[PDB]
Amino acid sequence: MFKAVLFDLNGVITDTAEYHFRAWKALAEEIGINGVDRQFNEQLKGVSREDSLQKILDLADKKVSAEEFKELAKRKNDNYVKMIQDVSPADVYPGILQLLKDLRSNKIKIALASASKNGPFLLERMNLTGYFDAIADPAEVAASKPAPDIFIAAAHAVGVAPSESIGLEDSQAGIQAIKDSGALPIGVGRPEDLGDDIVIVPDTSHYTLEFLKEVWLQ
Ligand SMILES: O=P(O)(O)OC[C@H]1O[C@@H](OP(=O)(O)O)[C@H](O)[C@@H](O)[C@@H]1O
Numbered sequence: 713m714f715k716a717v718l719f720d721l722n723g724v725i726t727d728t729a730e731y732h733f734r735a736w737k738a739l740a741e742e743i744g745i746n747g748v749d750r751q752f753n754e755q756l757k758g759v760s761r762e763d764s765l766q767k768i769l770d771l772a773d774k775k776v777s778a779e780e781f782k783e784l785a786k787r788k789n790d791n792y793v794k795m796i797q798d799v800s801p802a803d804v805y806p807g808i809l810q811l812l813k814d815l816r817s818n819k820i821k822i823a824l825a826s827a828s829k830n831g832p833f834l835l836e837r838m839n840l841t842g843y844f845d846a847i848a849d850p851a852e853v854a855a856s857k858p859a860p861d862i863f864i865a866a867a868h869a870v871g872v873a874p875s876e877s878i879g880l881e882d883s884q885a886g887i888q889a890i891k892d893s894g895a896l897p898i899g900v901g902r903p904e905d906l907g908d909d910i911v912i913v914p915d916t917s918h919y920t921l922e923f924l925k926e927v928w929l930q
C-alpha cells in the first residue's frame with residue numbers, strides 16, 4: 713500500500729497554463745521575439761520560470777545580462793500573478809477536493825511537487841493548504857521536470873521514499889520526473905501524450921482513492 717501521493721499543481725489540482733502562456737507571449741512580444749505560440753508553450757509544462765525564459769531567449773538567440781534576465785522573469789511573473797487574482801475554490805478540478813479528503817481520512821500523506829513558486833498562493837486561494845503535509849519548494853531543487861528532484865523532495869518531505877508513493881501528473885516532463893524518481897505515475901490526459909506503459913485517466917474525476925489503490929496492484 714502506497715504511503716503518499718505527490719501532486720503536480722497545474723493540470724491536476726487546477727490549471728493556470730493559459731495565464732502562463734499569455735504572460736510569456738506578452739513578454740516575448742515586448743522584447744522582439746517571435747515564436748512564443750501555443751505549440752511552443754506546450755513544451756513549458758512543468759518547466760521552471762528560469763528555464764522557460766531561457767527557452768524563449770533561445771528562439772531569437774538573444775543574449776541578456778544576468779540582471780536583465782532577472783528583470784524579465786520578474787516582469788512576466790508580476791503579470792502572471794495579476795492574471796490569477798480571482799482564483800478561488802471554484803477552480804479546483806473535479807474529484808480533487810474529495811481525493812484530498814479521502815487520502816487524509818485514510819492517513820495517506822499529501823505533498824505538492826509543482827515547479828511553480830506560485831504553488832502556495834494558489835493552494836491558499838483554493839482553500840487547500842490544510843490538506844498538504846508538505847510543499848516541495850521549487851527554489852530549493854536543482855532541476856526542472858523531467859528531472860526527478862522535485863518528486864524526490866516531495867516524498868522525502870512527508871517521510872517516505874518515492875517508491876512508496878503515487879505521483880499524479882499531466883505533462884510528459886512530469887511523467888518522466890515521476891518515473892525517474894521511482895514513484896508510480898498515473899497520468900491525466902491522453903495515452904498519446906503521456907505514454908502507453910502507464911495508467912492514464914481521461915480527467916481528474918477518475919482520480920479516486922479506490923482507483924489509486926486498485927492501480928497500486930495492477
Ligand atoms: O514559478 P512559476 O513561474 O510560478 O511557474 C513555473 C512553472 O510551474 C509549472 O507548474 P506545475 O509543475 O505543472 O504545477 C507550470 O506547468 C509551468 O508552465 C511554469 O512555468
Ligand SMILES: [Mg+2]
Binds near residue numbers: 721757882886
Ligand atoms: Mg503540471
